[PDB]
Curated annotation (Swiss-Prot), chain F:
The chain holds residues 192 to 242 of 244 of the full protein. F-type ATPases have 2 components, CF(1) - the catalytic core - and CF(0) - the membrane proton channel. In yeast, the dimeric form of ATP synthase consists of 17 polypeptides: alpha, beta, gamma, delta, epsilon, 4 (B), 5 (OSCP), 6 (A), 8, 9 (C), d, E (Tim11), f, g, h, i/j and k. It is found in: Mitochondrion; Mitochondrion inner membrane. Present with 12900 molecules/cell in log phase SD medium. The lineage of its organism: Eukaryota, Fungi, Dikarya, Ascomycota, Saccharomycotina. This is ATP synthase subunit 4, mitochondrial. It comes from Saccharomyces cerevisiae (strain ATCC 204508 / S288c). Disulfide bonds: none annotated.
Amino acid sequence: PPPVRLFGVEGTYATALYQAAAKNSSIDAAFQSLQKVESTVKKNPKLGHLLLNPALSLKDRNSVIDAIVETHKNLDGYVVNLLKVLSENNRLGCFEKIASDFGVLNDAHNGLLKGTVTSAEPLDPKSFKRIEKALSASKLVGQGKSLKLENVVKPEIKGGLIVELG
Amino acid sequence: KAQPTEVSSILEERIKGVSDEANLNETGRVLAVGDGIARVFGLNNIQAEELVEFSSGVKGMALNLEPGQVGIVLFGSDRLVKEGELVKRTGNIVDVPVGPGLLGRVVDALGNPIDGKGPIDAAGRSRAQVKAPGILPRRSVHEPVQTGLKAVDALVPIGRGQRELIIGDRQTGKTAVALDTILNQKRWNNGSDESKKLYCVYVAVGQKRSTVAQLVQTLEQHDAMKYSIIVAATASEAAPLQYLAPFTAASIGEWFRDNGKHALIVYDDLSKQAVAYRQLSLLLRRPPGREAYPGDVFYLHSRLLERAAKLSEKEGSGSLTALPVIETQGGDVSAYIPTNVISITDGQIFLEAELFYKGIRPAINVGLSVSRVGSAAQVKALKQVAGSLKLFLAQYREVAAFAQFGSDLDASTKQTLVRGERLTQLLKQNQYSPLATEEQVPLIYAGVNGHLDGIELSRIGEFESSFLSYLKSNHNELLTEIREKGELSKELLASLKSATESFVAT
Amino acid sequence: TNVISITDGQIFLEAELFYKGIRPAINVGLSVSRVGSAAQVKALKQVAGSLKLFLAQYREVAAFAQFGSDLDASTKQTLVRGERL
Amino acid sequence: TPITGKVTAVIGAIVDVHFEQSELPAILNALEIKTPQGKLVLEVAQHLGENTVRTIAMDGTEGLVRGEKVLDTGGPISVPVGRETLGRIINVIGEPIDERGPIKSKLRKPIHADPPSFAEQSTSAEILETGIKVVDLLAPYARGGKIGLFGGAGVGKTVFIQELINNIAKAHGGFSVFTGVGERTREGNDLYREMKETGVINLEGESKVALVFGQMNEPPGARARVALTGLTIAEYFRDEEGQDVLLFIDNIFRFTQAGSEVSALLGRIPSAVGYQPTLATDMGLLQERITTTKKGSVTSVQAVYVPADDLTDPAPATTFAHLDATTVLSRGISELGIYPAVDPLDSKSRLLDAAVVGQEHYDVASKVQETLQTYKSLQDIIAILGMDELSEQDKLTVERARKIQRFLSQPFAVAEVFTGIPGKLVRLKDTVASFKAVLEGKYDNIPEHAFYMVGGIEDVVAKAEKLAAEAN
Amino acid sequence: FRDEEGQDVLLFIDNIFRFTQAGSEVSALLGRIPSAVGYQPTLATDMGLLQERITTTKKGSVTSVQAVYVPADDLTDPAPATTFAHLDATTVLSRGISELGIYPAVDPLDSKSRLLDA
Amino acid sequence: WVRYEASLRQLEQRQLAKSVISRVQSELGNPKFQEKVLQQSISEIEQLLSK
């Protein structure tokens, strides 16, 4: 069983890739080829983004996938098979690349922004969520202190409505 | 208002406590919203059918806990709401502020007061969809009641838990039939008798707020708001509000009847509730069913009506008699919602279009109207003595059924026609004029005994008033006994015959 | 509709006929058969050639007798013939 | 080892459990999800693949947190069975709704089970006498058969079923049962009351009746499977007990309605009249299961509430076939005022033949139906022109038919609430003779209003004399 | 045949009502949603194409003769009315009160001929 | 007179809300949000350390 089901939407392919590669070690090995592939796609503005279009022919889709894999052994591992399978199954998997990254984080990294009344963009890369959270929050407050602005606490709206409606 | 300042301080203190104990880190973010339905991701552990508190302020129910995207309809306007706003899990199934204190207060969908009277106390906030009592916790209709307007009511009673239904065209005033029915909660409820108490709770499902004001004023002026909690759902109000409103009325009915006192309910125009369920289903994702309306229309209608019953002494012998009101187009008895409901409700009172302009302010189709309990749970005045009068009501209705173009075969048919037609011109209990359990049988008894039938048909419109006033100020002992003794005995029948002779005389 | 467009015809046994006591209930007027007497033993045919026309006439007088009034000789004879048949 | 599944999604009353293991729950088996308010058992309905099976709820669907551990019984819902069932009004899960505690059942057969074997079907022509005039002559009730009373919404279905129950049960000679689907709550309460009062179920003594109630309140899946539970109890009481068992189903159209509500949320494309895509097949599987094989006798009363009061509705149309002795009651006859409301020109029993109830009875019914059909056929010209404008033969037939139709109603023992008269049970032979006479004019001069709500022609003559005394 | 032989080439169609049933069956059989008649989307295009195939040219004419089976007084059907008002002349052969004592089985009353001028 | 009193009471809450709008505008305009940021941090730290 994967760390948590990603609720589909072309995330089925990524979920299956995570499960199969988790049968093997294929964890950093899987994510590394994916990161290289995504970087390569970004490295070609066109022919790698316009290549992520439905209009690409089946021969064209297989050829584009093969050419992307042609960047030496940057397409090493089961990611090659997944890319070829998608080449006819579903053309667009950049979101599937991000989902593979999400699965990798779920396997190893975890963590997401808390929120509540803060709009901060931090991270807490630790399995536990009962110790490091406070340290991460205080650090991100005392270091950087970027645009975490929710404008104001919604309780202002709460009190305003509460008083304004008897 | 310094009290408003204190209320603000208390509410903001509660909000500060809530913020300090937010316990909301992985709670859902609304992915998209529309048509009062908001598709929201996250909320990974939200219990099904639990209210969700949304950042834009308007909350809503969570209906379809779909794989991943948990669908929460918005119980308020969308102009405030937007995608990506945080969705806060209330953690509780939708529950309504319920209790005896709501008396005289008009409450919104979940029970938010809307008149402007401030808070109303609570004797429990139960979920909007309670499981109705089964067989053993249920009982028969052993205690009768009064519908107030004669309104073919002694003909077809409305007893303990009698799930009666109605129908009519647009602006048919079936709402007014309901209002008059409610006003009868002043000749028994306004006393002090719990056994006579039938604490009505009307509903307002999808009506023009001006009509709501008219209802409120008519409740106050005739002094009804002392006994009627009218849950409101504006037409301008959002679809989820209207859909949940009948469930709120169900909750109020549980809060009353479950306590052990005999209570009553009258759902508003429920056709609007059905249209709201249509909006909720056909707008969120659910495929439509029969008559293009949502498939579970019967399910929702039953879960509303089936809540009403008359429990046994095991549960306190209390009851929540209900008078659900459905609407058609063109007075259509034959419709999906109308016919399906008429299967669910145990009584029907059909209001036509012709008669609604033809001959009666009530215009209740006596022949068409029926209730599944005529004997058991009828006005003991109208049956224990006037049971022959009930059979005569059925017989004269059948008689007037054949009175269209047939010839004059004899004099018996013609006499039955004239007497029953005078009776029908009589029986319409004028609007907002509930006065019944005193001379109900009198009309049919005098017709067969030839007291009113000898009067002119048109003149009866005042002759009845004179006869009633004569019974009041002249037959005061006998009339008061008929009110109170619970039966019109043969001796009381003779004294009423004497009073009838007096009425015929003067 | 599709069957009646594909089938050979019909014996459209309307419920009124079976209710009218005629059991079996082939509503002769509403019946049909594309093949017909050409697929029949002619021994039947010699009498059916008149039976069909007699039933047809009875169909022509059904309304007249439905009025329940008098008429000419042909009409009354047709009604008696049709009812008897 | 234990089988546990996680509720992946709960949409309407059709919930999903993604049992993420090898041996997924079998189709049509019971999955139990432990809601704090009880055992919300589920019917594993469609193995939607990817280790996900969609279930129909057997109880409430509110508050089921996505991911609740669902434990699998594995086999069908094991409805308790046995004589102990008698006097206890079980619930759709077989849970004893009677507040008498658990019922000690020696065994529990599966709710879903194989229908009767095609070669074990004891054809019978025995007519069960119920006493009601339309039941008396127009359509005989087959003894140990399946009599379906397909009729409009409460326009007589509930009352007719109740009266038939109060009639047959006393001399049932076996162990009857009552099964309801979508029963009006007050009507269910009244049925329980009448069964208790009639002595049919003795609270502390012997009971010939065991009830399963599926009132309309329940969730759709419960409404659909409650009648199946009743049928399982009935078949168990028919084979294992091997004695005549009268099982009556009220508003079996509600079962099809449950199918319709469930199906759309279950992902089946909409069918005819929006009905469930599998109306006939499921209705057969829950109807053909009920039959009187050589193992035992089964008296089946399966009332169908024809939606929209027009028997053209696809669900009632599929219902009409599987039932033997059909006693249709429609609002047209009711509006005339006749309480028994049976459409005599329509309600027919294939159990009725020449050699079944008597050549004289067959001829009497044939003449009566012919006369009534004549009245209906001439009604158009009657209204358009008048009774005088047609034949005196036609006028005489019309008058006799009107008298006959007014003779169709009768006072039923439990309907005394409405008509007020103590109930009258017309003897089958007496009724046939009375009708033959009335068509033959042995009482054609009696009063029309003295022909409604009486017993046989004897009570008709008594009523005519009473009308001679009073009306004058 | 009209294009090549250039003689007045007749044209008879067996059951244009069956043709329309087939067209609707094709549309439903196809994924398309049949709604340009209320039960048929393609009825317009296909029926018009088939009818306008029967055309008159300067070289010559190819007279058609289509049989529009009456679905037992189907006055409601939009496609039947389109077919009936898609032609010019017709003959009505009823089995009731028209085949009665008639081998032609026709009804000279209900028939019509737009080409009929003195 | 009673109706006038009820309307004036509503006018009171309306005017209070209208001045509350200016009061809220003051909160952003004055950099007490700086004085509010530390409070937010402390409250969140306490909340996370709660469990």
